[PDB]
Symmetry: D2
Subunit: 325 residues, 4 copies
């Protein structure tokens, strides 16, 4: 027996199709159907019995928490089946780290869930999607891949959903985790596992969203010279339950940001101080408002905070989640 893998498609440049091979604008991300991706790499059938299912077909900049919630619920159904050994999810690069991390916290199975994406459309010269998809299927079907949390596979690398991020606007090697590295790499049709993440996920995670149809509102505000108080006022006004702050340095806040945060907290908004820098630890500091994001970047921090707020409003518990998830 080959493993049985479902390829659950959501869209992205991996399913993008353009007029010529050199073209990288004007084409639609999420134009091609899941079977077209599979038929472009017939080699996948030597690795697994694959079945394509079209979940959606959108550019990932339009992916929304309400859709991601349904994606999570669907993956959980699929993995509950005896005839499904793993799932590969095709997705746009722009917000794959948000969807992936969401599933990392909410999927109740040790079976592999592997997000895969492409920086060049399927019609491009030296398109990356075909090899990226092959590698994702190899990963999803290996018995050694079980219990590792949700994975993001591109460019011969296996990244943990919790650490991996799109570090570059436009390159093929954009997905990196500068301080945490890759869980593994795929070279010469062989998987080499290097690390296991030392964080809670999947079957050891408290978060369960089955039955939910929507999520708490969380917005992200940037920190910079002359950052304005009025954006905190606007967020509070629009009923946010959480604000993630993409702070200067180690979550440092200006006098204007401190004023906005204190206002937010008066209204019961939970504030998380993250960093705009790209990497590293925002340490605890009792003198400043809000909780701290540990090493979660702003986009990951929003996902965790949303999920946390489905369960609790207790700052002590939420802070512990940030240190452990």
């Amino acid at each position: 027996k080959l493993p049985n893998i479902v390829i659950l498609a959501t869209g992205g440049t991996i399913a993008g199709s353009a007029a010529t091979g050199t073209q990288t604008t004007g084409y639609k991300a999420g134009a091609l159907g899941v079977d077209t991706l599979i038929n472009a790499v017939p080699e996948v059938k030597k690795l697994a019995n694959v079945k394509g299912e079209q979940f959606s077909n959108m550019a990932s900049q339009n992916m929304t928490g309400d859709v991601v919630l349904k994606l999570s619920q669907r993956v959980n159904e699929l993995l509950a089946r005896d005839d499904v050994d793993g799932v590969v999810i095709t997705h746009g690069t722009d917000t794959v780290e948000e969807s992936a991390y969401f599933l990392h916290l909410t999927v109740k199975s040790d079976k592999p869930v592997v997000f895969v994406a492409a920086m060049r459309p399927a019609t491009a010269i030296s398109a990356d999607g075909p090899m990226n998809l092959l590698e994702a299927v190899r990963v999803a079907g290996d018995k050694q891949s079980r219990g590792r949390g949700v994975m993001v596979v591109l460019n011969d690398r296996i990244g943990s959903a919790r650490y991996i991020t799109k570090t570059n606007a436009s390159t093929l090697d954009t997905f990196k985790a500068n301080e945490e590295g890759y869980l593994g790499v795929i070279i010469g049709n062989r998987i080499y596992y290097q690390n296991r993440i030392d964080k809670l996920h999947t079957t050891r995670s408290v978060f369960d969203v089955r039955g939910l149809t929507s999520l708490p509102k969380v917005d992200i505000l940037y920190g910079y010279q002359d950052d304005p108080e009025y954006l905190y006022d606007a967020a509070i006004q629009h009923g946010v339950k959480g604000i993630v702050y993409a702070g200067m340095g180690a979550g440092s806040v200006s006098v204007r940001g401190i004023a906005g945060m204190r206002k937010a907290m008066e209204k019961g908004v939970v504030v998380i101080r993250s960093t705009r820098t790209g990497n590293g630890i925002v340490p605890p500091d009792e003198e400043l408002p809000g909780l701290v994001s540990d090493s979660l970047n702003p986009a990951h921090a929003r996902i965790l905070l949303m999920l946390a707020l489905t369960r609790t409003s207790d700052p002590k518990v939420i802070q512990e989640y940030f240190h452990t998830y």
Copy 2:
């Protein structure tokens, strides 16, 4: 014999002083005076005739465009003097890239301007500031350092103001330019120059702010799943002239972001699409609203846009500035 260097102090953790050597919260950034920094490294007097001038003493997260404008005007006065060979500017790490890039565009001299900072306070065990300051002074006093644009010096590295960024919340090696590298390095008391930036700066820059007392209002908004339209409404409402968008991937915009941007542009707000990723090129795309940031990250892009708006409101000219500065 020796070069004459002014050390112009603005604050920062480099001037921070705590109760113990292991302490890194509760202490005040910008507590120590410039002469206390100089007297902690008397070795600097073998490199240069140094003179300390206290420009300000704040944490850099509170640095503002109006103050940076005065800093630029002061540096231009200093460099106009025959008895000043270069300037070293002590500053906080959190927004040094913004202040540095501002001076990179507005300083009308080939004499060296070198920003220097520290991630650990002056009282810390293995504090970095002493050696960082020594290196900055060596750089500022070398004849080979002339004509290179504004520099940021920490941890044995010389970064261009246009490329360097704080990449990590909390580490000593935080300042990197992943795609562009360092202008040079300082090893064994010797400067090794590697690159010259291929962009316009200082004496070849069209931007001149002498006589200005304030700058156009420019805000930065983040891109993420479920990003809200109402933050664009708030910005427009508060009279911004420019919005920098810290976009998903290559400046990709959601349907909500597109609606906010189109509204902004109807009111004459100039929109620049940058990236939240940390690195790389946002390419032109005539199908999407706004201009593109080229390789300027959101913080640098705000600075350039502010300065551009002091000279023009022509999108074609502003776009050209983003490709040349």
Copy 3:
């Protein structure tokens, strides 16, 4: 209350002492005694009951396998004691990755073994050794540090012995593992664990060298354009049991290298093909002579091969060790 930590000193720039603070040549690495290091950071005594033991005092470029063997044997004696909770080993940066990886494979305890080093001498301005030592002691005394394999601590980072390497000749942030990241980081006097290495080590390792008094001879030969066959001849002639080849690219071998390798193997020399590149996988290739190093760089590969050859001469078993250690 506090853990009991032995600080076992071997030398290195961490123990180096120069005539001035800016000096970085002419000084002797491994000049200062272990108690002088401890007394320079009295803060260590709030973290642990420390005891210094002078094992040696040499520059690490002179460290030899016979000495490393004794170091391993000693650490195993120390860790067998009820009154020792962990060991910190002060060492030179140049070959710390070789000594650390040796201990990683031979130390029969889950108690922490933490190597520490410094790129600047103890007398330098902004010397890194004091903070590095303090961090190493924090790591060695934490209960959470147990069972993680041997660690190398510098510059706020905790590297696994198996992955970490000196990547730069002269910088403070030199120790990195580009593909595998750090096991953890130490920020704000707090340890943040990120990864557990997915390889065999310490208490799950087959390698045991207690009672040995010497090791098999293994040399390292470089791969490059016009590489010569006569260096393989010289190695065979001097009785090597193993050759690690620091190959072009993915362990690629010239016609001359193939000839040298075939000669070596005819004499029963075990050949491992590694890479000079710095990073990544050398994949299996039945067409080429020798075994492959997986992701072990040449220095690590020499250590593993030496240890392997104390137990077996079976190529199949040795190759498996390279994929699992």
Copy 4:
């Protein structure tokens, strides 16, 4: 209208051809002819009038200094012609940095010379060579590419021959210059120049090898724990004129290495201390034997030393070359 570009083919995995699309051993590097590469990307004809010339067809691990000398001589002939605007050289990845740097020092023209390579064979799924070639042709034909020294183009990046190196055995993104960055990047069919190298090359280089038919013999020896003296004896015995030492840390030498080096120097062998670390400066140290490689890695250092020895045996002049080329 279009620039005239010669594509001069030497072999490599870019010209490699395998039995299936997933295969990466058993195939021959340098199997396909230059016209087959060109015809696989007919899009190149919109960028340039291209002409293929087959210089050789070998795996680059077999490239030799005598062949590289001919390659340089041929490129100089081509660039002397009015009907040649630039040259793209197809080559294997394993030693492209050595051949590229050789040309960087010996090519007497400001016209672009661009080396290009591929990590996956031409028959692979998601092969990189087609896009890499197209980018190389774009770079070679752009007027803005003149006067930049020799370039290595892969994966959307333009590296200087002096800084770029294969950092990873097996990945597509392997070519990096960690401290010096890229000269530029190619994104969205547009070239973005970031840096100019601050070193002597091409038209400003003293090295001229036209008329030479062979080069001085230079070998490379590795530095590691227990490194043997007898390899220096072997090298001396075989008539080397130079030895490059791939040293521990900053060119640090063991007692055994010092003895070998002193022996070599007595026989008039020039010794250059480089580093095995991958990056950074080997600083001067008059106490230790030999000259220092500045930031040249061992493979580059061999190239420069060979060329230096064609002109001089004066240590002072050779050392100055290492600081300026």
